Amino acid sequence: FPSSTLAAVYYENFVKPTCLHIIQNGGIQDDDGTKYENSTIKIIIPQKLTTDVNSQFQTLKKSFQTKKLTFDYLGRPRNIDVETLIQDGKLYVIDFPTVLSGINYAISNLLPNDFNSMSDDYELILNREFDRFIYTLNKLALRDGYNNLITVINEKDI
Amino acid sequence: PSSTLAAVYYENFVKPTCLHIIQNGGIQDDDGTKYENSTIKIIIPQKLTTDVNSQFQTLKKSFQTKKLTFDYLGRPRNIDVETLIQDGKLYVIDFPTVLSGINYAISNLLPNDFNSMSDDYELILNREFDRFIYTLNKLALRDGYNNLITVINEKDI
């Protein structure tokens, strides 16, 4: 499974763009004009799908606010869509990486059936893919110096 | 060239479907019509199924959900599938949801190509499609289900 490549795709086309907006703009502005100088990114790696009725975050996501962030990238204007949540005077860009949704589907809907008695072994392999994804995401953030803008959190560590 | 995700999908979806087809002598429609020559068409998409510019964005809602019951190692079990009856043939049709993360990368992330690496990333991700197909075919042949199943990469059709 291409976990490191999926982490690079996700970082370079979502996470870094978001960081570049936060840095260039001095935070994310709410629609009323309120700028949040304390704008950070929270990346949560879920176990089950967020839409699963037995998921921790099945309701949280409805509280998010969609924003279109504009930023400059190598001198050219670009934009990206993020989901935000304000807490304690701080703005959080929150994302469950959809590039992992295939494994989330395996965890919610296929592994619990365990027809061939191998689900424990399979599930260990898939969780190691989540570990390599998180590892690569942190290394890329550190490479670019965005490690204080980004927290990556595995659901198992909640 | 093996995929664990393919093995999970095969063992918990494809093989259950095949065991119903074999045990039932085909899949029955709601009117009771039994389609003896019931087959499975597994389509490996490039874009998401919901993507507005995907071949199969429209096809999907023409399908009818069916609960297949079957016996597995002495216990009664079931699996839910989506069927299409066309020209006297019943096809179980599935876009493996275990591949949706790669479909999301291909539809929603790679076209932005911020760092001009999308072409290389896309070659690497397509490797996962090839390994998925290889694994499904190998497991289907192992179990003698290879004539029940057709695995189609979008790149080939």
Numbering used by the authors:
A (entry chain A): 158 to 315
B (entry chain B): 159 to 315
What's the publication's text?
A recent groundbreaking study discovered the ancient origins of the cGAS-STING pathway in bacteria, which play a similar role in the immune system to combat bacteriophage infections. In this study, we demonstrated two distinct mechanisms underlying the regulation of bacterial STINGs and a structural basis for cAA recognition and oligomerization.
The major α-helices of one ligand-free RiSTING protomer, α1, α3, and α4, have “anti-parallel” orientations with α1’, α3’, and α4’ helices of the other protomer, respectively, henceforth named “anti-parallel dimer”. The anti-parallel dimerization is mediated by α3-α3′, α3-α4 loop-α1′, and α1-α3′-α4′ loop interactions, forming an extensive interface of approximately 1400 Å2. Superimposition of anti-parallel RiSTING with cGG-bound RiSTING revealed that the bound cGG will cause severe clashes with the side-chains of Y262, N266, and L267 and the main-chain backbone of residues Y262-P269 of anti-parallel RiSTING. In the absence of a ligand, the conserved arginine residues R233 and R235 of anti-parallel RiSTING moved away from the ligand-binding pocket, accompanied by the extension of the β-strand, further hindering the recognition of CDNs.
